[PDB]
Amino acid sequence: PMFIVNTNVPRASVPDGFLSELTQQLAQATGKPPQYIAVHVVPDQLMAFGGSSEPCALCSLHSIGKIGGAQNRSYSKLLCGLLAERLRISPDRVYINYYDMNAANVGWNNSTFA
Amino acid sequence: PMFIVNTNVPRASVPDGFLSELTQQLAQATGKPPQYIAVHVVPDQLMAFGGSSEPCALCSLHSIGKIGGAQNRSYSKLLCGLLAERLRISPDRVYINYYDMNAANVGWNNSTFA
Amino acid sequence: PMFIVNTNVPRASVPDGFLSELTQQLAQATGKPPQYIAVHVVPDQLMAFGGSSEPCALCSLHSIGKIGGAQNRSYSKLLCGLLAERLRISPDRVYINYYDMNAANVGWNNSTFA
């Protein structure tokens, strides 16, 4: 998994340990080793959700498989959970776009995963 | 709709009002309640288009359906129009990537839209 | 092609001419005129790869065609190569998501490419 969070929450509100926590929890959730997982948090963004500038997040999760109805519902519960607990963002002010990438369409280490 | 604009125009050149305007215009254009609409503007970016650092924008619009030939042509007119009028970006220096998301592949409120 | 790189490398470490070099090299790789090529570099990011905050990058390449097994392998070698040489990022700490966009789903100059 690679997970990207873009939020209007300020940098000083992202707690120490957050990228490590995301990494571990995504490892646990996907049954994938943590060495594969990438995470990225972009705070201080100029964003709105429903025309409001209260805390919100626009996120992406990309995986090579392990994407599907049930799996995505569990990922959304985990990730909204974390964003609510650590960043004080309401789950109904979060979108997470999920992408099932073909191995041939993911570059890594001078080649692809195909 | 959720609309993201990345641009090398400076923060101070983004009008107060712009996120609200995008939200309202997007609501009009899609017929979606504005409560569902998210917008995000990212100024000051290190970017080039055609090798030039003249104002430009890289954007995305994600929707659950309501994406297709005619619809995307109308969105591109609307959104290039706004970026030209408000951020003084030439329409020929804008890209908009459109994504028709499956409901099961959009997380929100601890679950998905499926 | 449009290429976006997000990295925890600091802005001061991005050398002069980097966006110009990406443009020119992407033109060469895809055969496409540099005039349509967009590039975007986002340094100083809060990111981790494999649970580690060593230099890393998460990137995307969108093209209307010119995406496929061998092409993307070639692009990955090219781009990981530039990121290593210029930003001192190890190739094994780079992910590049490739997107073959339908021409109907790419907005430019008030319309789409369909």
Residue numbers in the entry:
A (entry chain C), B (entry chain A), C (entry chain B): 2 to 115
Give verbatim lines from the article.
Macrophage migration inhibitory factor (MIF) is expressed at high levels in various inflammatory diseases and cancer. Macrophage migration inhibitory factor promotes directional cell migration (or chemotaxis) of various cell types 2, 3, 4. Unlike canonical cytokines and chemokines, a trimeric MIF molecule has three tautomerase active sites at the trimer interfaces 23. Although the enzymatic activity is vestigial, there is accumulating evidence that the active site is important for receptor binding 24, 25.
To structurally verify the proposal for the inhibition of p110γ and p101 expression, we co‐crystallized 1, 2 and 12 with MIF. 1 occupies the bottom half of the catalytic pocket, whereas 2 occupies the upper half. However, this steric hindrance theory does not explain the inhibition of MIF‐induced migration of THP‐1 cells and HL60 cells by 1 that does not have any solvent‐exposed ring structure like 2. In contrast, MIF:ISO‐1, MIF:1 and MIF:2 show relatively increased B‐factors (>10 Å2, >30 Å2, and >25 Å2 respectively) for the L2 loop. As MIF:1, MIF:2 and MIF:ISO‐1 inhibited MIF‐induced leucocyte migration and increased B‐factors in L2, it is likely that structural stability of L2 is the critical structural determinant for the chemoattractant activity of MIF. Pro1 attached to 1 revealed the longest displacement (1.9 Å) followed by 4‐IPP (1.1 Å), 2 (0.8 Å), 12 (0.5 Å) and ISO‐1 (0.4 Å). This suggests that 1 might disturb the protein the most. The displacements are 1.1 Å for 1, 0.6 Å for 4‐IPP, 0.6 Å for 2 and 0.5 Å for ISO‐1 and 0.2 Å for 12. This suggests that the displacement of Pro1 upon inhibitor binding within the tight active site pushes and destabilizes the L2 loop, resulting in suboptimal MIF binding to receptor. 1 inhibited 79% of the total number of neutrophils otherwise recruited by MIF.
